[model samples]
Target chain A: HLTPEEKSAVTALWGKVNVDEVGGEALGRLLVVYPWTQRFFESFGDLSTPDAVMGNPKVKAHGKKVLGAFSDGLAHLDNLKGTFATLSELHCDKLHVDPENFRLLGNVLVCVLAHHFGKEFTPPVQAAYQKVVAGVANALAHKYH
Target chain B: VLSPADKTNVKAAWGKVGAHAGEYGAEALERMFLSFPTTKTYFPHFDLSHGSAQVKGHGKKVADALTNAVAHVDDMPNALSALSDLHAHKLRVDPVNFKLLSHCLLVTLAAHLPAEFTPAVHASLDKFLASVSTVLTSKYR
Candidate 1:
């Protein structure tokens, strides 16, 4: 699903996907962008505002859940889709996740990278990231895909 | 949400595939299951063979939906909205299967209709399928 150029671009971008910020923003944006998603996070608490949601400890830990999975996603680009199968099993096994949720979750991370690293997240990089996000997103839905 | 040129390209291309829609649909659906394997989860009760009628018939059902969408290309969301509502609450099917199935159709079309599927047609079909899938998957809880 990715060309050599796209692979290189995604590979280059992975290093910058550092620190806790990336994970936090990715999961937080999901809840913020679609609070209906908060139904899963009913146990997450503090769904007041963008700031509050981002600040929630439950949200923070959950961010680690996704981002940690993505870290393996970074290492196994060739097997990226399969790499995400376990996470999807963890999720899709019980959760009746809507299809868009998979795509949206990944796209937000792409945007979040732009939010923090736009200087490098150019159009080509964005394009590559999209392919990566789509791959990873589909992988996240592997249980059902 | 396709441009005028895109809609024309899609509609025209679909015409060629329409006569063989059932055949193409089944082959493409079969390829999706075989190539991606995990997609079988969505079809747990069905046969998973090379020439299964169940898969073929369902593929025809999908192609018929696509045919109907072609008639109302500009407003696919509403066209498929009722089905969308049902899938979400009743089945809650994962969305990625739509993308996978679309990818297989592109592969199937390219392999079979290589001469007719020009770059423009190729591009437009991809756009059309993505838009169609988006509509199908958008109405979830």
Candidate 2:
């Protein structure tokens, strides 16, 4: 559970991003660093390069959905069951997206935010974001084991 | 606008329906597709005609979203905007279909929570759903 200060920090910092662009950038970096992630998205064909992935309209729209879901999860941290029930079922059972992949994405998101925020992304702020990401990852993994 | 009493009743009644979210969710989807055949055009890939796994799964997702929306009634627009954007922009779903589904959802909720589903509750829920539909279609306007 995030302390009130931690929650406030997360909301304030995450609110700064244009969620769509930042989310797309994070996913683009993931695809570039870990090419295997591209296999999950058949519709965005040949998105192996950052330029290709960022340029694709389909990828950009999907990035929005990803970040939107994260934002919703953060907003409802107190009622995560309500927030993540659908996501848990979809990711764990139906889609079976790898838990390790989720972890990797979490790391990629932190790196992306660090680059975007630069001086503003202090160690304490980084810890807060990590906690939020871990909470979401744990929620996704609830039905896995 | 919903009165304080109305919000309380709506919340209490939704709590009952939400307990069996999967069941009512599937029923709503089935009823919506059956009652308004045109809505199925939005999901051409899915076999929404029957109680298939896809229908049940998607139905549960819809129910979860609605439940979450009601749970955060004060932030209704933000709570539902992701779904709204997906349906309105990416999926290009006609706004009328959302109204049609809202009708189906009301019927499903009524059936599930007959005791709590009073006239006042019905009116409040209708108003709330109408607002949801408006937010969902705001981008179009």
lDDT of 2 by residue, B52-82 (tens): 9999998889878878878888888899888
lDDT of 2 by residue, A87-125 (tens): 877875556465556667888999999998999999999
Task: Give the docking tier of candidate 2.
Answer: incorrect
lDDT of 2 at B107: 96
Per-model TM values vs. the true structure = 0.54, 0.49
Could you tell me which residue pairs clash in candidate 1?
A: A99-B95, A145-B39
The recovered share of true contacts, given per candidate in order, is 0.12, 0.00
Highest DockQ scorer: 1
What value does the lDDT take at residue A9 in candidate 1?
Answer: 81
Tens digit per residue, CA lDDT, model 1, B85-113: 76654555566678898999999888878
Model 2 chain A — which ten-residue stretch has the worst lDDT? Answer: A92-101
Candidate 2 segments whose C-alpha is farther than 4 A from its true place: B1-141
